[PDB]
Design a protein around this ligand. Structure first.
Ligand SMILES: [Zn+2]
Ligand SMILES: [Zn+2]
Length: 249
């Protein structure tokens, strides 16, 4: 929390002064992995092995994915989160977006001289913007920006989950799954305040015969994940009933 985290960023900056932009990441991953190999944690050392291999090969997206999983299961880890944000910032610059890279860099700077996890989550949303900005959508970036602004003034770890749902909608809107109208309706429902009208809209579109049994369950499980970290038991039951109806019946 402000210590043992600023040294990692300082070393990253020294090894990035050259301009390699890839050996600094590997050195930071090494620094993190040494602190967790000296312990008796064999679940994190192997994960950092895989992450370093992915970064060295060039497949940083898999690294950000599995580091995201790690930081979600265990948010106590703060150097792992710092290296995750560094890899996110490095990957964003490869996608072709220089202003999102600047936003993530300032997020790293504010995370180093603090220790609050509320910035890490914010970085995720910025990262997601890049992804959403690459799939083609432009009207989905604004909702993500609104969530990003609302995270930096509330610090709720439940606003990145809605961004994950929006990313899922953007992904399905491209491949050939659920069409534009449902995407816009669900985005509008997730935007304002509704996580219960989303369930009803998905069910209504499923019964009317406009959504497959796989995309509907994907959206419903994402909504259940959002509703399991909000302290709601009148929406966990609703999501469970909807998943039961769509899945089997
Ligand atoms: Zn993996
Ligand atoms: Zn039925």
């Amino acid at each position: 929390g402000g210590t043992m985290l600023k040294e990692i960023l300082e070393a990253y900056k020294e090894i990035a002064r050259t301009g390699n932009e890839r050996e600094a990441l590997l050195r930071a991953i090494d620094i993190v992995r040494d602190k967790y190999s000296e312990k008796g944690d064999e679940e994190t050392d192997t994960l950092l092995h895989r992450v370093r291999l992915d970064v060295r090969e060039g497949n940083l997206e898999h690294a950000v994915e599995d580091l995201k999983k790690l930081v979600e299961k265990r948010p106590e880890l703060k150097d792992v989160a710092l290296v995750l944000i560094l890899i996110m910032a490095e990957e964003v610059k490869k996608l072709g977006f220089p202003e999102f890279a600047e936003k993530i860099e300032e997020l790293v700077e504010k995370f180093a001289e603090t220790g609050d996890i509320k910035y890490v989550y914010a970085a995720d949303i910025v990262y997601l913007m890049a992804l959403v900005k690459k799939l083609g959508d432009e009207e989905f970036v604004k909702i993500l920006e609104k969530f990003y602004e609302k995270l930096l003034e509330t610090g709720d770890p439940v606003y990145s989950l809605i961004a994950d749902v929006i990313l899922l909608l953007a992904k399905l809107l491209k491949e050939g799954e659920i069409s534009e109208e449902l995407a816009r309706e669900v985005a509008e429902l997730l935007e304002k305040g509704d996580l219960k009208g989303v369930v009803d809209t998905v069910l209504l579109y499923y019964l009317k015969g406009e959504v497959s049994k796989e995309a509907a369950v994907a959206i419903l499980e994402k909504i259940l994940k959002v509703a399991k970290a909000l302290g709601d038991e009148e929406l966990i039951k609703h999501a469970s009933l909807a998943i039961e109806h769509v899945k089997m019946d």
